[PDB]
Amino acid sequence: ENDEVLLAGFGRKGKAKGDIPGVRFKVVKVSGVSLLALWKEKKEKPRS
Amino acid sequence: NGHKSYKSKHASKGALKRLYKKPDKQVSKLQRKNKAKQLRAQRILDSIENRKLFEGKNGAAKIITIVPLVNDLDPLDILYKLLKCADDEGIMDSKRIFNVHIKKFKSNLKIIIPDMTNFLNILDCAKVADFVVFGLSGVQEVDEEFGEQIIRALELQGIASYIGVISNLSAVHEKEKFQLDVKQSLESYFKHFFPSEERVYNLEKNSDALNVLRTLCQRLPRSINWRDNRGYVVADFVDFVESGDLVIEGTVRGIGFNANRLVHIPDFGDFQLNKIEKITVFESNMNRDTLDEYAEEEERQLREFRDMEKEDREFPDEIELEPSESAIERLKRYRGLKNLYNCDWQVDEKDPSSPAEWKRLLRIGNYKNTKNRIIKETKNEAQAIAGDRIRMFIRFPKFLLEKIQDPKQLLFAVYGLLLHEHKNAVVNFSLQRWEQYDKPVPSQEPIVVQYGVRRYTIQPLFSQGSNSPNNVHKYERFLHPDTVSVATCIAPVDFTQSPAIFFKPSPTDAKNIELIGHGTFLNADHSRILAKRAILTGHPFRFHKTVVTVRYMFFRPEDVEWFKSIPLFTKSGRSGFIKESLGTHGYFKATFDGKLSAQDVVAMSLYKRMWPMPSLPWN
RNA sequence: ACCCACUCGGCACCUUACGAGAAAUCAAAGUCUUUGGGUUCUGGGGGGAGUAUGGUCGCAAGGCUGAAACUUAAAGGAAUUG
RNA sequence: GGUGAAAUUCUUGGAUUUAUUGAAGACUAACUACUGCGAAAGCAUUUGCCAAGGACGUUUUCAUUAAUCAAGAACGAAAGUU
RNA sequence: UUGUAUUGGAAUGAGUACAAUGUAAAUACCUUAACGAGGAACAAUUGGAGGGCAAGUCUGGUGAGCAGCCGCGGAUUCCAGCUCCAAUAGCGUAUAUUAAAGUUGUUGCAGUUAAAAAGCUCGUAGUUGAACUUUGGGCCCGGUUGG
RNA sequence: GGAUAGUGGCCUACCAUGGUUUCAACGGGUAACGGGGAAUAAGGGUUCGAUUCCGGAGAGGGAGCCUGAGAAACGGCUACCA
């Protein structure tokens, strides 16, 4: 909580995606670092 | 029905009868424009309200901390090169804390320099800063055993803002293109820890050093969540009066203070303030909270854990009985269950190994709805607020006076407590291993944990994370080599979900500390029942079309009878049950879901309640 | 009045398909990817909805005109058969 | 009398049923159909009056006066309003 | 003359550098003495392997994950390791727009039963409106292209 | 008639009652500066053009004016509003 995040569309032009009722957006970056880089252990998140 | 029904694009009135049981506005261009303008006025006024705190010599100072990552550097070179670009030599001594006003930017700066010998004192200094200036050397690269551990630790407690600086790159001159090659390497390294930043300044160049100075003066820092919900001040001076009445003066920086609060000092513990004044006086009105807590042989020990953890990894919770051992007297405490997720195990069980404190313990339930509620009241009750110059009078035990140092030479800092945080409770932590800490961790072994400012010696209990409907979970002997885990103990609560760091003292190491893991204060939850599981095992050896008989699991007919009711299972996954005792040696015969064979093993599971141990401060 | 032949106009019926069609079927539902005789009206996946709001007609009951936010992967037509 | 069965109701001052007469309001059976008329809604006992209409017949007359149609206008089952 | 593994001489720029050239003065390109490759560590990535749509009956785990769509799982679709495919100094994602689209249709849609012919007739603006008037036949010149 | 460098309801006096519109006037909206041009190649089209050239407008918002062949100028002046 109180993290800052960047959001992008979930790929369906304003519709929700697949199984998920009413969820239309996906997280792309947190605190200025990309989630993909965290998942692959390429960068590190500074706390706040 | 069998009939082609009627169709209409909208419902007929017949259909509606069975089913049974201000103006719109157009935005004209002017009022469209007007709204946007008066909205912008709010945004701009709001930006001023933030900035007024730093506005000038009448405002608050900004706290800068310098941390050289290599002893080659000497921090005085860093500060000196900054001060030159202020272009006022009247700015530029037997001390490590400095107050400066910069005419060029009408800005007030406080510089704190930590003693690089005391690793723990670095964290305490950096914990209070708005800006941390990292010094890098172009000549010698940071060492993994010390220099990196500074960076890694500071990130996990949280940092308000950071700047990368170089001060000596000309020491490798041949042509400045060779300097650029090095600078690119340092930036690529630095960005690994701080991917928000893409520039490292070279202070040997006037343009860069001026650029750095401007940033410290003009720009605002990030907030630190767990800190700013409390109050804190830094001591300008300290004085003592008669068992003592210690006086501190400084500036408020957190959410605020009230004279009825409690005050924590990281090395010494909690104390009560008696008065406040503004540089009007406020006094501790006794309708207040109070200080109550309630209402080479080691090679063998290391080898033991290394061997035992290897065994537990292969065959978890398996137990051996022995001949002439009573299974009852060994094991009577174990209840035996079909499934932990389905058992009705009572939380505040009355068994004698339960701690003496139960009603003595604070229990909360909805931690979320408690946390936010408490803060809302606290910010409303604040008497002194950010930027107030203040004096404070504190009940200070006179014998600790031997531990006081002149604040000009060492960082002395003061933190307000939240109301109930002094009370002990059952607390839960997330935990995962440090970057390469492959050592085995025994579940009972004592550890020192820092979370927020305060730190405690703790002996944990480990378990895996899941959402069981009853909060019952398996106790585990050792920390999993990979997954995150939940650790439980008794400690004083924190409402701010502070980050937590896990380490063990080791004066054999250059930094006196061995680093083990990190995590977060999750919640207080007494319902988080831990059950110690045990597995007994025996060998099926004779086989019939309807029953099988099993050896070695028990040695007395009395024991087979006493434990008859607990279900059996094979590790190949079949269930079964005891029929009856056979003979005097404790053989039994049993029935299962299907065909077994001597390549299978027969097991049974039993469960015992566990309770958290208490904990004590560390210094 | 009736019978036989012819003819103009009309409500229908039976057989056939050079034709057409998703098929039931159709003398028009034909003269269409080989796409142009003249001209009026209406539709653009399923719900929200003939709802809300504005206007206008009526003594009243009500008539005419008539959205959007949001939601969803189908709804629907003809025919035979296990 | 009425129903699957029964009760409310009428009647020994006579019900229901039979005979001779009278009054009122509505409707137009059978003939009546793969038949007729009308712009559509719709239209069926006889006779009289009023005005209108299609098709046919025509070696009469005018000579492009025409086709479709926003606005505007006449009519419009049953129920409903004064 | 073509594949699969121990072994040998040759070739070169990326990079660095005397010099000249370059330029207002410089940096870099073009030229060049010296130095500069054997796991030639002087080490190429980004997305996938049920179908649409190129490419796994491989193997270990498990009973939260994947998936634009259809679907997998109480395992050819998850997770890990081999192997394979595609584009390649580039490759993926979000949003808007164009094409495929004859789902805006003048070229070129549709209205019995699938969304869509207004209860019916009159009628102004608008769009549209039958046939007919010098046609045919002679006599010179005549350019271009090919016989 | 006045005023302008000069034509003209540009302004003043007197007089007449005109002017535009279903071939859409008047009013509302534009996340609207116009054009040369840009993307998308069967053909017809659809979407975009703040931005290297041409033309217009403005110098925080409105108004006024000096000097000069040329300005209602803002790296000129004067007043009000913020």
PDB file of N, CA and C (backbone and C1' of nucleotides) in Angstrom, chain B residues 175 177-178, chain E residues 14-23 25-32:
ATOM      1  N   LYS B 175      43.346  10.257 -20.934  1.00  0.00           N
ATOM      2  CA  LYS B 175      42.495  11.158 -21.687  1.00  0.00           C
ATOM      3  C   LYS B 175      41.104  11.009 -21.101  1.00  0.00           C
ATOM      4  N   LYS B 177      38.320  10.552 -22.269  1.00  0.00           N
ATOM      5  CA  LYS B 177      37.586   9.398 -22.774  1.00  0.00           C
ATOM      6  C   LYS B 177      37.813   8.172 -21.898  1.00  0.00           C
ATOM      7  N   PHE B 178      39.012   8.029 -21.328  1.00  0.00           N
ATOM      8  CA  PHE B 178      39.247   6.944 -20.381  1.00  0.00           C
ATOM      9  C   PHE B 178      38.470   7.162 -19.093  1.00  0.00           C
TER      10      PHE B 178
ATOM     11  P     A E  14      36.278  -2.058 -38.397  1.00  0.00           P
ATOM     12  O5'   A E  14      36.161  -2.638 -36.924  1.00  0.00           O
ATOM     13  C5'   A E  14      36.130  -1.738 -35.826  1.00  0.00           C
ATOM     14  C4'   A E  14      35.856  -2.419 -34.512  1.00  0.00           C
ATOM     15  C3'   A E  14      36.341  -1.667 -33.293  1.00  0.00           C
ATOM     16  O3'   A E  14      35.551  -0.564 -32.911  1.00  0.00           O
ATOM     17  C1'   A E  14      36.770  -3.976 -33.064  1.00  0.00           C
ATOM     18  P     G E  15      36.258   0.851 -32.646  1.00  0.00           P
ATOM     19  O5'   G E  15      37.362   0.537 -31.544  1.00  0.00           O
ATOM     20  C5'   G E  15      37.017   0.217 -30.207  1.00  0.00           C
ATOM     21  C4'   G E  15      38.204  -0.301 -29.431  1.00  0.00           C
ATOM     22  C3'   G E  15      39.356   0.668 -29.253  1.00  0.00           C
ATOM     23  O3'   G E  15      39.139   1.595 -28.216  1.00  0.00           O
ATOM     24  C1'   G E  15      40.199  -1.427 -29.871  1.00  0.00           C
ATOM     25  P     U E  16      39.685   3.094 -28.356  1.00  0.00           P
ATOM     26  O5'   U E  16      41.271   2.951 -28.316  1.00  0.00           O
ATOM     27  C5'   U E  16      41.949   2.685 -27.102  1.00  0.00           C
ATOM     28  C4'   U E  16      43.416   2.404 -27.316  1.00  0.00           C
ATOM     29  C3'   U E  16      44.255   3.549 -27.846  1.00  0.00           C
ATOM     30  O3'   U E  16      44.627   4.505 -26.880  1.00  0.00           O
ATOM     31  C1'   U E  16      44.857   1.551 -28.921  1.00  0.00           C
ATOM     32  P     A E  17      44.959   6.002 -27.348  1.00  0.00           P
ATOM     33  O5'   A E  17      46.202   5.867 -28.338  1.00  0.00           O
ATOM     34  C5'   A E  17      47.523   5.672 -27.862  1.00  0.00           C
ATOM     35  C4'   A E  17      48.521   5.564 -28.991  1.00  0.00           C
ATOM     36  C3'   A E  17      48.692   6.791 -29.870  1.00  0.00           C
ATOM     37  O3'   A E  17      49.496   7.802 -29.297  1.00  0.00           O
ATOM     38  C1'   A E  17      48.527   4.894 -31.234  1.00  0.00           C
ATOM     39  P     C E  18      49.615   9.224 -30.032  1.00  0.00           P
ATOM     40  O5'   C E  18      50.743   9.040 -31.145  1.00  0.00           O
ATOM     41  C5'   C E  18      52.109   9.108 -30.781  1.00  0.00           C
ATOM     42  C4'   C E  18      53.060   9.061 -31.954  1.00  0.00           C
ATOM     43  C3'   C E  18      52.980  10.163 -32.981  1.00  0.00           C
ATOM     44  O3'   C E  18      53.452  11.421 -32.542  1.00  0.00           O
ATOM     45  C1'   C E  18      53.536   8.090 -33.987  1.00  0.00           C
ATOM     46  P     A E  19      52.754  12.770 -33.074  1.00  0.00           P
ATOM     47  O5'   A E  19      52.635  12.598 -34.659  1.00  0.00           O
ATOM     48  C5'   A E  19      53.767  12.741 -35.502  1.00  0.00           C
ATOM     49  C4'   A E  19      53.459  12.477 -36.960  1.00  0.00           C
ATOM     50  C3'   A E  19      52.473  13.407 -37.633  1.00  0.00           C
ATOM     51  O3'   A E  19      53.053  14.654 -37.968  1.00  0.00           O
ATOM     52  C1'   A E  19      52.061  11.173 -38.306  1.00  0.00           C
ATOM     53  P     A E  20      52.150  15.975 -38.105  1.00  0.00           P
ATOM     54  O5'   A E  20      51.405  15.810 -39.501  1.00  0.00           O
ATOM     55  C5'   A E  20      52.097  15.959 -40.729  1.00  0.00           C
ATOM     56  C4'   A E  20      51.316  15.363 -41.868  1.00  0.00           C
ATOM     57  C3'   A E  20      49.979  16.024 -42.155  1.00  0.00           C
ATOM     58  O3'   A E  20      50.104  17.189 -42.949  1.00  0.00           O
ATOM     59  C1'   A E  20      49.663  13.715 -42.010  1.00  0.00           C
ATOM     60  P     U E  21      48.969  18.324 -42.929  1.00  0.00           P
ATOM     61  O5'   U E  21      47.634  17.604 -43.401  1.00  0.00           O
ATOM     62  C5'   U E  21      47.414  17.269 -44.758  1.00  0.00           C
ATOM     63  C4'   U E  21      46.113  16.533 -44.926  1.00  0.00           C
ATOM     64  C3'   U E  21      44.865  17.284 -44.504  1.00  0.00           C
ATOM     65  O3'   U E  21      44.389  18.179 -45.486  1.00  0.00           O
ATOM     66  C1'   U E  21      44.815  15.141 -43.567  1.00  0.00           C
ATOM     67  P     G E  22      43.702  19.558 -45.051  1.00  0.00           P
ATOM     68  O5'   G E  22      42.400  19.119 -44.260  1.00  0.00           O
ATOM     69  C5'   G E  22      41.313  18.512 -44.933  1.00  0.00           C
ATOM     70  C4'   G E  22      40.276  18.022 -43.964  1.00  0.00           C
ATOM     71  C3'   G E  22      39.593  19.100 -43.148  1.00  0.00           C
ATOM     72  O3'   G E  22      38.482  19.639 -43.836  1.00  0.00           O
ATOM     73  C1'   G E  22      40.333  17.372 -41.722  1.00  0.00           C
ATOM     74  P     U E  23      38.381  21.204 -44.167  1.00  0.00           P
ATOM     75  O5'   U E  23      38.123  21.905 -42.766  1.00  0.00           O
ATOM     76  C5'   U E  23      36.871  21.806 -42.110  1.00  0.00           C
ATOM     77  C4'   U E  23      36.965  22.317 -40.698  1.00  0.00           C
ATOM     78  C3'   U E  23      37.477  23.733 -40.550  1.00  0.00           C
ATOM     79  O3'   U E  23      36.472  24.690 -40.830  1.00  0.00           O
ATOM     80  C1'   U E  23      38.551  22.334 -38.987  1.00  0.00           C
ATOM     81  P     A E  25      41.642  26.559 -38.553  1.00  0.00           P
ATOM     82  O5'   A E  25      41.674  26.205 -37.009  1.00  0.00           O
ATOM     83  C5'   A E  25      42.539  26.890 -36.123  1.00  0.00           C
ATOM     84  C4'   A E  25      42.267  26.505 -34.694  1.00  0.00           C
ATOM     85  C3'   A E  25      42.328  25.015 -34.411  1.00  0.00           C
ATOM     86  O3'   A E  25      43.646  24.572 -34.151  1.00  0.00           O
ATOM     87  C1'   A E  25      40.342  25.909 -33.504  1.00  0.00           C
ATOM     88  P     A E  26      44.029  23.034 -34.358  1.00  0.00           P
ATOM     89  O5'   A E  26      43.113  22.302 -33.290  1.00  0.00           O
ATOM     90  C5'   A E  26      42.459  21.081 -33.577  1.00  0.00           C
ATOM     91  C4'   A E  26      41.448  20.759 -32.510  1.00  0.00           C
ATOM     92  C3'   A E  26      40.838  19.374 -32.576  1.00  0.00           C
ATOM     93  O3'   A E  26      41.660  18.394 -31.976  1.00  0.00           O
ATOM     94  C1'   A E  26      39.130  20.964 -32.286  1.00  0.00           C
ATOM     95  P     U E  27      41.703  16.899 -32.551  1.00  0.00           P
ATOM     96  O5'   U E  27      40.254  16.320 -32.254  1.00  0.00           O
ATOM     97  C5'   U E  27      39.872  15.942 -30.945  1.00  0.00           C
ATOM     98  C4'   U E  27      38.469  15.395 -30.915  1.00  0.00           C
ATOM     99  C3'   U E  27      38.209  14.215 -31.831  1.00  0.00           C
ATOM    100  O3'   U E  27      38.660  12.982 -31.315  1.00  0.00           O
ATOM    101  C1'   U E  27      36.456  15.759 -32.052  1.00  0.00           C
ATOM    102  P     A E  28      39.279  11.894 -32.315  1.00  0.00           P
ATOM    103  O5'   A E  28      38.067  11.511 -33.272  1.00  0.00           O
ATOM    104  C5'   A E  28      36.977  10.738 -32.800  1.00  0.00           C
ATOM    105  C4'   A E  28      35.901  10.584 -33.844  1.00  0.00           C
ATOM    106  C3'   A E  28      36.341   9.940 -35.145  1.00  0.00           C
ATOM    107  O3'   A E  28      36.332   8.529 -35.109  1.00  0.00           O
ATOM    108  C1'   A E  28      35.086  11.887 -35.608  1.00  0.00           C
ATOM    109  P     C E  29      37.190   7.696 -36.180  1.00  0.00           P
ATOM    110  O5'   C E  29      36.521   8.006 -37.590  1.00  0.00           O
ATOM    111  C5'   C E  29      35.290   7.420 -37.980  1.00  0.00           C
ATOM    112  C4'   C E  29      34.820   7.950 -39.310  1.00  0.00           C
ATOM    113  C3'   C E  29      35.671   7.543 -40.493  1.00  0.00           C
ATOM    114  O3'   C E  29      35.418   6.224 -40.919  1.00  0.00           O
ATOM    115  C1'   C E  29      35.164   9.822 -40.662  1.00  0.00           C
ATOM    116  P     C E  30      36.631   5.295 -41.382  1.00  0.00           P
ATOM    117  O5'   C E  30      37.225   6.055 -42.641  1.00  0.00           O
ATOM    118  C5'   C E  30      36.599   5.985 -43.910  1.00  0.00           C
ATOM    119  C4'   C E  30      37.373   6.775 -44.934  1.00  0.00           C
ATOM    120  C3'   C E  30      38.818   6.353 -45.115  1.00  0.00           C
ATOM    121  O3'   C E  30      38.976   5.184 -45.893  1.00  0.00           O
ATOM    122  C1'   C E  30      38.712   8.685 -44.980  1.00  0.00           C
ATOM    123  P     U E  31      40.024   4.058 -45.449  1.00  0.00           P
ATOM    124  O5'   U E  31      41.438   4.784 -45.468  1.00  0.00           O
ATOM    125  C5'   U E  31      42.084   5.082 -46.693  1.00  0.00           C
ATOM    126  C4'   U E  31      43.429   5.738 -46.493  1.00  0.00           C
ATOM    127  C3'   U E  31      44.485   4.953 -45.742  1.00  0.00           C
ATOM    128  O3'   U E  31      45.061   3.908 -46.499  1.00  0.00           O
ATOM    129  C1'   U E  31      44.549   7.200 -45.074  1.00  0.00           C
ATOM    130  P     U E  32      45.619   2.593 -45.770  1.00  0.00           P
ATOM    131  O5'   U E  32      46.758   3.104 -44.781  1.00  0.00           O
ATOM    132  C5'   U E  32      48.044   3.477 -45.252  1.00  0.00           C
ATOM    133  C4'   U E  32      48.948   3.936 -44.130  1.00  0.00           C
ATOM    134  C3'   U E  32      49.303   2.913 -43.062  1.00  0.00           C
ATOM    135  O3'   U E  32      50.349   2.032 -43.434  1.00  0.00           O
ATOM    136  C1'   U E  32      48.706   4.952 -42.034  1.00  0.00           C
TER     137        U E  32
END
